[PDB]
Design an enzyme around this catalytic site. Sequence first.
Site: not given
Ligand code: A1A18
Length: 269
Positions: A47, A50, A82, A107, A109, A145, A212, A214
């Site tokens: 992410s 972004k 998300w 974050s 999507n 993806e 962040t 993830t």
């Molecule tokens: C687990 N998780 C988190 O803890 C925290 C976030 C917010 P980020 O840290 O990316 O800004 C997060 C964002 C996601 F897009 C995501 N998906 C990824 C694609 O596959 C499905 C799960 C998971 C996510």
Amino acid sequence: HMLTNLVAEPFAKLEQDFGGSIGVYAMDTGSGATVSYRAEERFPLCSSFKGFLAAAVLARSQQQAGLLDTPIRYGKNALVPWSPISEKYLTTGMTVAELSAAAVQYSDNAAANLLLKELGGPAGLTAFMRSIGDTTFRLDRWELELNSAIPGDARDTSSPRAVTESLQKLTLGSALAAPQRQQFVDWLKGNTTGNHRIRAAVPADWAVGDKTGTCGVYGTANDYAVVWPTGRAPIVLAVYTRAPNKDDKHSEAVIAAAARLALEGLGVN
Ligand SMILES: Cn1c(=O)cc(CP(=O)(O)O)c2cc(F)c(N3CCOCC3)cc21
């Protein structure tokens, strides 16, 4: 200016305990002193693109006076997992500015994919990054993806160094006009998803903005930040992880520890 050697052994130990790879680049904007650990290796953005996406929108807003106020309507099929803000405004739409704030601070999507469309896709954001002198950054795909984090795959990756260099240009340098620069900083300062990462290594009396990432696989997660310690120049840093096995888990604690080690290397309080 070197300074890594103060903390090169501690990084390798942290990395060995984590069971994957940690990539760090930190810059003292006062002295130009740096800490580097795997700083030139590619890691998945997840992410973290972004934040740069929101900066690219702000840059476009300097040429297009109405852009941030433009209402954007979207269908249910735009709501990928998300999308915590865009799901609440499905029936109303949101402005470009609101989507940008959601992409940065939650974050979101769906918001990210909608703003990617506005810029001409992943190549449009890549083009913006090239325009500020980042030759490393590459976005290739959309949400979700781009989170595949396949070992060895350069798609949707950058280096800790390039991330820090670009974050400095956008938040503290001249890559944005002053009003857009302060809007970018304010979005990062209002991020809600970073409390357990770089922020966990920053005293309560220091200002911080972060973004962040993830990916959810291959132990892959990250954070980058601008930190304003009192009484000295700001610090810009990037902390990225990945790991060899698809079911390896990321660690927020390892990101906070790496951030702590970077700040200790720079001699920051
Ligand atoms: C687990 N998780 C988190 O803890 C925290 C976030 C917010 P980020 O840290 O990316 O800004 C997060 C964002 C996601 F897009 C995501 N998906 C990824 C694609 O596959 C499905 C799960 C998971 C996510």
